[PDB]
């Protein structure tokens, strides 16, 4: 729901964001502090979804 | 025996060293940008922004 948004943690994984980016299933796609195509070289930990 | 009898030369050397040291230390300032490192900020945002 709106006031009870689900929260999940992503860690210890390998993620191919290319298949998510080229996918047209997502109507709108805005990445703020990182370039959309620059997610395949740098990476992080404790991803919050 | 007596020390600190050559204060002027030591002061000149200290002034030069301190000026160089603060010039070197100035590189760690964001200056209003996202980060103070060129390589990492280059690999995060598209060249348009």
How would you describe this protein?
The structure is cut from a larger assembly and holds two copies of chain A (49 residues). Chain A contains one helix and two strands. In chain A, 12% of the residues lie in helices and 8% in strands. Chain A is globular and about 35 Å long. A two-stranded antiparallel ribbon of chain A has the order 1-2. Chain A has 49 residues and is mostly loops. At the A-B interface, loops of A face loops of B.
Keywords:
2 chains; little secondary structure; Spike protein S1 (chain A); viral protein; SARS-CoV-2; Spike protein; Spike glycoprotein
Provide a short characterization of the protein structure.
The structure is cut from a larger assembly and holds 2 copies of chain A (49 residues). Chain A is low in regular secondary structure and 49 residues long.
Count of DSSP strands of chain A:
2
**Helical stretch tally of chain A:** 1
Termini separation of chain A: 15 Å
The best one-word shape of chain A is: globular
Q: Into which percent range does the helicity of residues of chain A fall? A: 10-25%
Largest interface: A-B, 7 and 6 residues
- Which series of helices and strands of chain A comes N to C? EHE
**Oligomer, anyone?**
part of a larger assembly
- List the strand order in the largest sheet of chain A: 1-2
| Rg of chain A | 13 Å
Structure class of chain A: little secondary structure
Q: Biggest β-sheet of chain A: count, sense, barrel?
A: 2 strands, antiparallel
Portion in strands of chain A: 5-15%
Protein name (chain B): Spike protein S2'
Organism (chain B): Severe acute respiratory syndrome coronavirus 2
């Amino acid at each position: 729901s709106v006031y009870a948004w689900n929260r999940k943690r992503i860690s210890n994984c390998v993620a191919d964001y290319s298949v998510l980016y080229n996918s047209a299933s997502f109507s709108t796609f805005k990445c703020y502090g990182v370039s959309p195509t620059k997610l395949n070289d740098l990476c992080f930990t404790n991803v919050y979804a | 025996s007596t020390a600190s009898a050559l204060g002027k030369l030591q002061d000149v050397v200290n002034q030069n060293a301190q000026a160089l040291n603060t010039l070197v230390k100035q590189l760690s300032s964001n200056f209003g940008a996202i980060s103070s490192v060129l390589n990492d900020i280059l690999s995060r945002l598209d060249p348009p922004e």
